[PDB]
């Protein structure tokens, strides 16, 4: 066998012998998380059971799309690390175990809790934020659900995000980007406004907006556009950010919406520093940029990684790119038994995966050639 039965959950938690299943952890309508220890290397880990992952079509989708893109943005710093898979029952399985870098908590409970921030904590979440962004974005892939749930931190105040069950394509067409599927929404509070007014402008801009959500969240403390409805969330994006020009107003792509909010009161932009009268002025000044409510005015990442707030952090040397752009052909599939045999061989190949000029050289290469000069 070569495995070990836990109880977590009132179900079964199966997971390889060398581990310790030691403290809960969250759980999802997607799955569960515990944290684990490796008894030998005393390396602590967390293990996510992805659970009934055949009981929909749409949720062994997400699987597959979790699997590979986890494997695709494998080694960045703010990216949660996989570091194993597991299927225990293969003949019958309907759950896959993902063993990833552990974490202490997410950003949300964080703010939950009430702990002071300072200025510094903010920029060093924004900051950490938008490299792994630039890195799924380098990779032509959009994260789609930026939001404090889904950014991981510990104990060194290190942030990493996760959950790419979300993800979508994004491409230069045109024909590509309207093929590219997203099966669920958002989350509403983070979401950016041209989605719910039909833009039609799927672009790298929408997780910009979401980190402009988390920036004014930190801020503030609480979630700052609140909307209980899709209606009272565009409410209140606009008592902040204004009535908006004609321009913008003409690519609300969807009649109700746009006959809406042309009727509308005027209403006025409610300026950042009014809002938030103690925050660093640079930090409202790049929170201006990514929370601009047309897309097309919105900061992209690589100009706010060189905005002035994070001036201490930002070094271009130190935020790479992806090396390869990340398929979804995927994703056309549509007979759960082949996304069954595909997600197999997603955890088998990367089982065995895992288990596989300096002054120095100049000077190397200038006493090799001193040593044997003559004779």
């Keep these: 066998q070569g495995r070990k039965i836990f109880k ?13 299943v030691t403290k809960e952890l969250g759980q999802g309508a997607y799955g569960i998380v515990c944290a684990a220890v490796n008894n030998q290397t005393s390396e602590g880990v967390a293990i996510k059971k992805v659970t009934n992952v055949f009981s929909k079509k749409i949720l062994a989708k997400r699987a597959l799309r979790e699997i590979k893109l986890l494997q695709h943005f494998r080694g ?37 809790s009430g702990q002071p921030l300072t200025d510094a904590h903010f920029q060093s979440f924004i900051y950490q934020i938008l490299c792994g962004l630039k890195y799924i974005h380098s990779a032509n892939v959009l994260h789609r659900d930026l939001k404090p749930g889904n950014l991981l931190v510990n104990a060194d105040c290190e942030l990493k995000i996760c959950d790419f069950g979300l993800a ?24 950016a406004p041209e989605i719910m007014l039909s833009f039609q402008s799927y672009t790298k801009a929408i997780d ?102 994070l001036h201490i952090w930002h070094d271009a040397s130190d935020e790479p790119d992806c090396p390869t752009t990340f398929n979804f052909d995927f994703e056309v599939v549509e007979d759960v038994g082949e996304m069954r045999k595909m997600i197999l061989d997603e955890v088998y ?12 050289g100049q000077m190397n290469d200038l006493e090799a050639e001193l040593a044997g000069g003559l004779d």
């Design 8 to 20: 977590v959950f009132n179900q079964d938690f199966i997971v390889d012998e060398r581990y310790t």
């Design 76 to 112: 960045h710093r703010n990216i949660t690390c996989l570091y194993d898979m597991d299927i225990p029952r293969p003949d019958n399985f309907n759950e896959t175990y993902l063993y990833e870098e552990l974490m202490e908590c997410d950003l949300a409970a964080i703010i939950r």
């Design 168 to 191: 979508r394509g994004f491409s230069v067409d045109p024909e590509e980007n309207a093929g590219y599927m997203t099966e669920y929404v958002a989350t509403r509070w983070y979401r």
């Design 208 to 309: 910009v907006w979401s980190v402009g959500c988390i920036l004014a969240e930190l801020l503030g403390g609480r979630p700052f556009f609140k909307g209980r409805d899709y209606v009272d969330q565009l409410n209140q994006i606009l008592h902040i950010l204004g009535t908006p020009n004609e321009e913008t107003l003409s690519r609300i792509g969807s009649p109700r919406a746009q006959e809406y909010v042309r009727n509308l009161p005027f209403m006025a932009k409610k300026p950042f520093p009014t809002l938030f009268p103690n925050a660093n002025p640079d930090a409202l000044d790049l929170l201006d940029r990514m929370l601009a409510f047309d897309p097309s005015s919105r900061i992209s990442v690589e100009q706010a990684l060189e905005h002035p707030y």
């Design 349 to 360: 190949r990367f089982r065995q995966l895992v288990r596989t000029q300096e002054y120095v």
